[PDB]
Design an enzyme around this catalytic site. Structure first.
Site, short mmCIF file in Angstrom:
data_model
loop_
_atom_site.label_atom_id
_atom_site.label_comp_id
_atom_site.label_asym_id
_atom_site.label_seq_id
_atom_site.Cartn_x
_atom_site.Cartn_y
_atom_site.Cartn_z
N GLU B 13 0.81 -1.21 0.00
CA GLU B 13 0.00 0.00 0.00
C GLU B 13 0.85 1.27 0.00
O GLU B 13 0.33 2.35 0.30
CB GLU B 13 -0.96 -0.02 1.19
CG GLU B 13 -2.13 -1.00 1.00
CD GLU B 13 -2.99 -1.10 2.24
OE1 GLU B 13 -2.60 -1.82 3.18
OE2 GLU B 13 -4.06 -0.44 2.30
N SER B 159 -6.27 -2.58 1.19
CA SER B 159 -6.54 -2.08 -0.16
C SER B 159 -6.86 -3.21 -1.14
O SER B 159 -6.66 -3.05 -2.36
CB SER B 159 -5.37 -1.24 -0.70
OG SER B 159 -5.15 -0.09 0.08
N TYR B 229 -9.35 3.11 -5.86
CA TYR B 229 -8.48 4.26 -6.11
C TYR B 229 -8.61 4.86 -7.51
O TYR B 229 -7.88 5.80 -7.83
CB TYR B 229 -7.02 3.88 -5.82
CG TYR B 229 -6.90 3.35 -4.41
CD1 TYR B 229 -7.17 4.18 -3.32
CD2 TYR B 229 -6.61 2.02 -4.15
CE1 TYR B 229 -7.11 3.71 -2.03
CE2 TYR B 229 -6.54 1.54 -2.85
CZ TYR B 229 -6.80 2.39 -1.80
OH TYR B 229 -6.75 1.95 -0.50
N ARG B 268 -11.59 3.34 10.85
CA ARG B 268 -12.74 3.14 9.99
C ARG B 268 -13.20 1.70 10.17
O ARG B 268 -12.40 0.76 10.01
CB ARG B 268 -12.43 3.43 8.52
CG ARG B 268 -13.70 3.67 7.75
CD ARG B 268 -13.46 3.79 6.26
NE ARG B 268 -13.09 2.50 5.71
CZ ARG B 268 -11.90 2.22 5.18
NH1 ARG B 268 -10.95 3.15 5.11
NH2 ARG B 268 -11.67 1.01 4.70
N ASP B 270 -15.66 -1.28 9.00
CA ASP B 270 -16.32 -1.66 7.76
C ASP B 270 -17.19 -2.89 7.99
O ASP B 270 -16.79 -3.82 8.71
CB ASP B 270 -15.27 -1.92 6.67
CG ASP B 270 -14.35 -0.73 6.46
OD1 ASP B 270 -14.83 0.42 6.59
OD2 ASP B 270 -13.15 -0.94 6.17
N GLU B 282 -13.99 -5.66 8.88
CA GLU B 282 -12.66 -5.38 9.41
C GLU B 282 -12.66 -3.98 10.01
O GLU B 282 -13.52 -3.15 9.71
CB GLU B 282 -11.58 -5.48 8.33
CG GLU B 282 -11.76 -4.46 7.18
CD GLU B 282 -10.47 -4.08 6.45
OE1 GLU B 282 -9.36 -4.43 6.91
OE2 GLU B 282 -10.58 -3.39 5.41
N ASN B 284 -9.87 -0.71 10.21
CA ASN B 284 -8.63 -0.14 9.69
C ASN B 284 -8.24 1.02 10.59
O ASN B 284 -8.97 2.01 10.68
CB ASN B 284 -8.80 0.34 8.25
CG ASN B 284 -9.19 -0.78 7.31
OD1 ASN B 284 -8.35 -1.61 6.92
ND2 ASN B 284 -10.47 -0.84 6.96
N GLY B 288 -7.46 5.33 4.77
CA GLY B 288 -6.90 6.15 3.73
C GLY B 288 -7.41 7.57 3.80
O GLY B 288 -8.49 7.86 4.31
#
Ligand SMILES: Nc1ncnc2c1ncn2[C@@H]1O[C@H](COP(=O)(O)OP(=O)(O)O)[C@@H](O)[C@H]1O
Ligand SMILES: Nc1ncnc2c1ncn2[C@@H]1O[C@H](COP(=O)(O)OP(=O)(O)O)[C@@H](O)[C@H]1O
Ligand SMILES: [K+]
Ligand SMILES: [K+]
Ligand SMILES: [Mg+2]
Ligand SMILES: [Mg+2]
Ligand SMILES: [Mg+2]
Ligand SMILES: [Mg+2]
Lengths: 322, 324
Positions: B13, B159, B229, B268, B270, B282, B284, B288
């Site tokens: 990443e 990612s 992305y 974050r 999810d 998960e 994070n 990002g």
């Protein structure tokens, strides 16, 4: 082959770690320099570390972290630190970023086995029996669903520092206050009484080899700091006087826990036995190597001599790093 | 108040991390120096770091770790290093030893939240709904108790790197071989199909506050690297179209997981939604901050603008390191 051995540290187990370093230095079969982290976090190198080793305590060091140490002159680092800032993934993170092979558990295994709450959540989900417990955060009231006696611990501790056997619910507030002097999270566990304490050594990378099972016998209300490190206060029974089926289950459970947590290098896996039921108490990824310590004795009895044990640890470090 | 922002890293990443640094540097309301870890683990500082950021990749660095810089000059360190070595407790462990406040989760929470097996074990133990899964270690015969479709993942990925959607048992071997290029451990999960994806931001130390719930939609088979992305590929719905009882349930679940795992600073969280059925996918801990990233938009919708979000992250780092 040059080994760098780091001992001391800022945790309450600083003196224990210097005793461990004396044990390892007596037997390690490689050229080995010592580096000492003082109690104020500053490092001592060369002759000053060996002086601090002899005094068995170094309250003040010379060099702020990171120290002016020529890491490139060493092939492997042996982090012989116990507890916070040594056994908990901090030193292991530094060594990973250094790109240097090092002895023992990686960052995740080290951080998880130090945290008595998180390790219990992982092991309980994996089917490994653990003692009933709850976690408590500082400034938050405990919600304890089981009845006393309790054991109250900082979540990240070693050598029984900050632990209290609590017999009255009324003594729980003082016990948590003492626990919170060492960590922002505490655990309250149901105390087993009577209880036998069993310990088994594991050696290897993820897929371990188990030593014979040892037993700790003592007189004190629990295996406290004074009983652990005062000569003659604890009797180590090696191998333990343990019925064959329980002995087999200790070894199977230790190896399963070791694999699930992804431990590398070594661990001492400690268990409780009460009314015929086994409970996994904790894993310790940098077990003590003091004159009253169980881990090297366990493998010596299992046919792995003390210099051979340290050779295997150093070779497991090189093998994982490729 | 001076911040040292670290970005790049050795993980897959690395490029995403440089994109996140561009976004954070645009809005951070503090003097901020950039350090870049190049893909080879050597560091870039000063003008070379800013040049490498402009290039959006740094394959080769200059300084072997530990880098020649004074950590004492910085009040906070902001590791914006997604994936292995940066988000998994490694850089956090080094920073603990510097005695330096830093943004985001500590060593244990970082390590846990980057491991898709061990996080799921902890969350399932605490009663959090998660998808059926098993862990597979390299060289081990995979023993999967459920039938396909699977999702196969490196245990430490981000990612969507190394992730395969596996329809048939015949395709499992290739998927594990791909996952094992990135980690020594992989997970095989039961696939949800179809599925909606919900994401919620958290801010705070252990006892967090939740952003509004957002939803990610897309045309691709799953939320893969290209969809994440490519500008405009992912649709980012804030707030998510949910009835209010479901919204509160998602936010409460994210705060429960956040507290059980002992997360600090931010995360974050999810989720999967399968005709009303909720699973935590998960967490994070270094989400990002790219132009297509959800975390700043989510707190934007919760009345926290980008500079104020970054201020609060730095403030939370100081409040934890000192005092706690
Ligand atoms: N649930 C329990 N029941 C009985 N004794 C306990 C319990 N928890 C801890 N103890 C006693 O306290 C000692 C230290 O606890 P432990 O969790 O191993 O912390 P440390 O890692 O500091 O050794 C144990 O060896 C045991 O003697
Ligand atoms: N069990 C699953 N069922 C359905 N889709 C999944 C599953 N696991 C992963 N995915 C898809 O793959 C994406 C990436 O998986 P995730 O576990 O979040 O890894 P990463 O950390 O790489 O994003 C998810 O956002 C989702 O689109
Ligand atoms: K431990
Ligand atoms: K993650
Ligand atoms: Mg211990
Ligand atoms: Mg113990
Ligand atoms: Mg992720
Ligand atoms: Mg994801």
């Amino acid at each position: 082959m040059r080994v760098l051995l780091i001992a001391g540290g800022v945790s309450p187990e600083h003196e224990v770690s210097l005793l461990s370093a004396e044990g390892v230095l007596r037997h390690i079969p490689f050229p080995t320099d010592l580096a000492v982290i003082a109690q104020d976090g500053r490092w001592l190198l060369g002759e000053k570390a060996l002086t601090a080793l002899e005094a068995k305590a170094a309250p003040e060091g010379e060099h702020p972290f990171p120290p002016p140490l020529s890491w490139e002159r060493y092939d492997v680092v042996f982090p012989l630190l116990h507890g916070r800032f040594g056994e908990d993934g901090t030193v292991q993170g530094f060594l990973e970023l250094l790109g240097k092979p090092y002895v023992g558990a990686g960052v995740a295994a080290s951080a998880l086995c130090m945290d008595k709450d998180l390790s219990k959540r992982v092991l309980a989900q994996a089917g490994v029996p653990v003692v009933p417990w709850v976690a408590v955060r500082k400034g938050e009231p405990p919600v304890v669903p089981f009845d006393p006696p309790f054991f109250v611990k900082p979540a990240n501790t070693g050598s029984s520092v900050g632990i209290s056997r609590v017999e009255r619910f009324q003594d729980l507030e003082a016990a948590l206050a003492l626990a919170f002097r060492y960590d922002e999270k505490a655990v309250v566990e149901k105390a087993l009484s009577p209880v036998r304490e069993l310990e088994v050594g594991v050696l290897g990378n993820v897929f371990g080899e188990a030593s014979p099972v040892g037993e700790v016998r003592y007189e004190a209300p629990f295996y406290d700091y004074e009983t652990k490190y005062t000569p003659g206060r604890a009797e180590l029974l090696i191998p333990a006087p343990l019925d064959p089926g329980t002995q087999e289950t200790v070894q199977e459970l230790a190896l399963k826990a070791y694999k699930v947590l992804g431990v590398r290098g070594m661990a001492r896996v400690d268990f409780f036995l009460a009314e015929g039921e086994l409970y996994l108490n904790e894993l310790n990824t940098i077990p003590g190597f003091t004159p009253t310590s169980m881990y090297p004795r366990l493998f010596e009895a299992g046919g792995v001599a003390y210099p051979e044990l340290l050779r295997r640890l150093v070779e497991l470090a090189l093998t994982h790093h490729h």
